[PDB]
Design an enzyme around this catalytic site. Structure first.
Site, PDB file in Angstrom:
ATOM      1  N   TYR A 189      -7.711   7.092 -64.284  1.00  0.00           N
ATOM      2  CA  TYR A 189      -8.307   7.402 -63.457  1.00  0.00           C
ATOM      3  C   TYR A 189      -7.918   6.752 -61.635  1.00  0.00           C
ATOM      4  CZ  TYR A 189      -7.469   2.418 -63.448  1.00  0.00           C
ATOM      5  OH  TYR A 189      -6.597   0.891 -63.849  1.00  0.00           O
ATOM      6  N   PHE A 220     -14.083   6.149 -57.847  1.00  0.00           N
ATOM      7  CA  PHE A 220     -13.422   6.729 -58.390  1.00  0.00           C
ATOM      8  C   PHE A 220     -13.222   8.116 -58.688  1.00  0.00           C
ATOM      9  CE2 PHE A 220     -11.954   2.267 -59.776  1.00  0.00           C
ATOM     10  CZ  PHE A 220     -12.940   1.126 -59.688  1.00  0.00           C
ATOM     11  N   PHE A 245      -6.265   2.128 -54.122  1.00  0.00           N
ATOM     12  CA  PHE A 245      -6.290   0.334 -55.227  1.00  0.00           C
ATOM     13  C   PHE A 245      -5.884   0.501 -56.162  1.00  0.00           C
ATOM     14  CE2 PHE A 245     -10.581   0.342 -55.915  1.00  0.00           C
ATOM     15  CZ  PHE A 245     -10.157   0.166 -57.105  1.00  0.00           C
ATOM     16  N   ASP A 246      -5.325   1.850 -56.768  1.00  0.00           N
ATOM     17  CA  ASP A 246      -5.896   1.518 -58.830  1.00  0.00           C
ATOM     18  C   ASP A 246      -5.545   2.982 -59.049  1.00  0.00           C
ATOM     19  OD1 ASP A 246      -4.499   1.164 -60.934  1.00  0.00           O
ATOM     20  OD2 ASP A 246      -6.068  -0.374 -61.613  1.00  0.00           O
ATOM     21  N   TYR A 277     -17.474  -5.878 -59.104  1.00  0.00           N
ATOM     22  CA  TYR A 277     -17.147  -7.146 -59.247  1.00  0.00           C
ATOM     23  C   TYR A 277     -17.754  -7.644 -58.125  1.00  0.00           C
ATOM     24  CZ  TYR A 277     -12.607  -5.354 -61.361  1.00  0.00           C
ATOM     25  OH  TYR A 277     -11.587  -4.836 -62.054  1.00  0.00           O
ATOM     26  N   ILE A 336     -16.316  -2.899 -65.767  1.00  0.00           N
ATOM     27  CA  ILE A 336     -17.144  -3.235 -65.182  1.00  0.00           C
ATOM     28  C   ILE A 336     -18.151  -2.533 -65.184  1.00  0.00           C
ATOM     29  CG2 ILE A 336     -15.911  -3.531 -63.247  1.00  0.00           C
ATOM     30  CD1 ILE A 336     -15.434  -1.482 -61.787  1.00  0.00           C
TER      31      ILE A 336
END
EC number: 5.2.1.8
Lengths: 48, 107, 49
Positions: B26, B99, B36-37, B82, B56
């Site tokens: 991902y 994502f 961010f990831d 979140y 999540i």
């Protein structure tokens, strides 16, 4: 800008993309594997 | 609050089921386009088991609609994510997450 | 505020020497067509698509 085509997918092997330029309008149109891409660029600059 | 757009089609038959580990790659971005990831910058696929709520909600519902080998884009609403709290220092409050998930294999 | 860093892939462009355009009194035709066939694509050669 996402566009709609039959069987949408990122360009993959054995794919054929056809690009058409019509300076009269002006307009740019695409076809992926023969199916029209439901989106066109138009009314852009022509200074080149 | 999960919206799934296909990027590359999968096998189209195999689908994840509750109690089955999903091995995915991902790349998480905030909806304004800031990364961010990503599990590819770690060179290690991310494993999680469906139903245990280790991730999540948007991932659990989103990946369940995916097939093996499929690359899809998930747009997760903040309340399916979140939410108001938000991952501190990483994800701001009331953030919609985007994502780019690829279901590598089910194990 | 703070400067941001990330690893990105180099991207290059390749063109034919085919130039067309529109001008008043120009000698060029107005409509053109070409195709590109994809033979091999690695979806993720690096961490970036």
């Amino acid at each position: 800008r996402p566009v709609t085509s039959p069987g949408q997918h990122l360009l993959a092997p054995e794919d054929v993309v056809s690009c058409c330029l019509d300076l009269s309008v002006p307009s740019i149109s695409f076809r992926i594997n023969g199916c029209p891409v439901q989106g066109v660029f138009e009314a852009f600059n022509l200074d080149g | 609050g999960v919206q799934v757009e296909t990027i590359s089609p999968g096998d189209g038959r195999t689908f994840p089921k509750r109690g089955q580990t999903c091995v995915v790659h991902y790349t998480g971005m905030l909806e304004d386009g800031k990364k961010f990831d990503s599990s590819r910058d770690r060179n290690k696929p991310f494993k999680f088991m469906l139903g245990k709520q280790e991730v999540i909600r948007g991932w659990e519902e989103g990946v369940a609609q995916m097939s093996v080998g499929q690359r899809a884009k998930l747009t997760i609403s903040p309340d399916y994510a979140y939410g108001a709290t938000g991952h501190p220092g990483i994800i701001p409050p009331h953030a919609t997450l985007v994502f780019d998930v690829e279901l590598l294999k089910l194990e | 505020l703070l400067l941001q860093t990330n690893l990105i892939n180099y991207v290059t462009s390749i063109r034919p020497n085919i130039f067309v355009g529109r001008a008043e009194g120009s000698t060029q035709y107005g409509k053109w067509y070409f195709e590109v066939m994809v033979d091999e694509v690695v979806p993720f050669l690096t961490a970036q698509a």
